[PDB]
Every structure is written in structure tokens, then in C-alpha cells.
């Protein structure tokens, strides 16, 4: 079943993801998505690659898209929050702290974590120094 291979593709991409091979990583990650589009974990991982490639827009694009699928397939909400963190992180990098804190707080709504809570206060305290 593609579902099983999808799990392997995520690891194949993750493996290449740890070896700076973001291109090959996104390739396998994207493959896992075709093998199992209902699995938001694969989509979120894809965005993680774009975040490393510089495509913060695509990161927030696929991440939220993963939120849609996951929140629809009763997928782990904890992962949904981690995705929300990446969305806010994408903004946190493109100087869009306004949208960052937004999705950041959304991560606290799904799965409260010290990371996002730290980036939430970090994004607002930085935005103040920005204005």
C-alpha cells in the first residue's frame, strides 16, 4: 500500500534533509504526499524543506494546507500545532511578525508548547523594536 511506502518516503526525504539535500528531501517528501495526501505530516515536512530553501511562502503554504487535511482526517493535532509554528516561523523570517504571532497563538490553541510560546513573545517584542 502507498500508505506504508509513504512513511518510507518521509524517512527517505528526512534522511536527505539531514544531509543538506533539501532538493532530494523535498522530492521524497512530495512523493509521500502522493502516496498518502491525507497524511498532513508529510505536507508539513515538505514545508520544512522550503523553509530551508528560502521559500518561506511555500512553507506557510503547505503547512496551512496540512492543517486543512490533518484537521479533516482527525490527524494528530500536536503535529498541527508544530505546523502552525512553522507558519509563524515562516513569517518570523520574512519580517511578518504580525502574521507570525497570529499562527503562533494558533499553535498554542492546538498544542501548547514552550517553543511557540517563546517565539510568540519573541515575535511581538521584536515587532515593537521594528516599529
From Swiss-Prot:
Q: Where is this motif: Bipartite nuclear localization signal?
A: 3-20
Q: Source organism's superkingdom?
A: Eukaryota
Give any Gene Ontology cellular component.
nucleus
Q: Which UniProt keywords apply?
A: Acetylation, Cytoplasm, Isopeptide bond, Nucleus, Phosphoprotein, Repeat, TPR repeat, Ubl conjugation
Which molecular function terms from Gene Ontology are attached? Hsp90 protein binding; RNA binding
- TPR repeat start and end residues: 6-39, 40-73, 81-114
- Residues with the N6-acetyllysine modification: 82, 93, 106, 125
* Disulphides: none
Q: Which residues carry this modification: Phosphothreonine?
A: 113
Cite the domain annotation text.
Answer: The TPR 1 repeat interacts with the C-terminal of HSC70. The TPR 4, 5 and 6 repeats (also called TPR2A domain) and TPR 7, 8 and 9 repeats (also called TPR2B domain) interact with HSP90.
Reported function: Acts as a co-chaperone for HSP90AA1. Mediates the association of the molecular chaperones HSPA8/HSC70 and HSP90.
* Assembly: Probably forms a complex composed of chaperones HSP90 and HSP70, co-chaperones STIP1/HOP, CDC37, PPP5C, PTGES3/p23, TSC1 and client protein TSC2. Forms a complex with HSPA8/HSC70, HSPCA/HSP-86 and HSPCB/HSP-84. Interacts with PACRG. Interacts with EEF1AKMT3. Interacts with HSP90/HSP90AA1; the interaction dissociates the PPP5C:HSP90AA1 interaction. Interacts with FLCN, FNIP1 and FNIP2. Interacts with HSPA8/HSC70. Interacts with HSP90AB1; upon SMYD2-dependent HSP90AB1 methylation.
Q: What is this protein called?
A: Stress-induced-phosphoprotein 1
- Gene that produces this protein: STIP1
Q: Which residues of the parent chain are present?
A: 220 to 350 of 543
Amino acid at each position: 500500500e502507498n500508505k506504508k511506502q509513504a512513511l518510507k518516503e518521509k524517512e527517505l526525504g528526512n534522511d536527505a534533509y539531514k544531509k543538506k539535500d533539501f532538493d532530494t528531501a523535498l522530492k521524497h517528501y512530495d512523493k509521500a504526499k502522493e502516496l498518502d495526501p491525507t497524511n498532513m505530516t508529510y505536507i508539513t515536512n515538505q514545508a520544512a524543506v522550503y523553509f530551508e530553501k528560502g521559500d518561506y511562502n511555500k512553507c506557510r503554504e503547505l503547512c496551512e494546507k496540512a492543517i486543512e487535511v490533518g484537521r479533516e482526517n482527525r490527524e494528530d493535532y500536536r503535529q498541527i500545532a508544530k505546523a502552525y509554528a512553522r507558519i509563524g516561523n515562516s513569517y518570523f523570517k520574512e519580517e511578518k511578525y504580525k502574521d507570525a504571532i497570529h499562527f503562533y497563538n494558533k499553535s498554542l490553541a492546538e498544542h501548547r508548547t514552550p517553543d511557540v510560546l517563546k517565539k510568540c513573545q519573541q515575535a511581538e517584542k521584536i515587532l515593537k523594536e521594528q516599529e
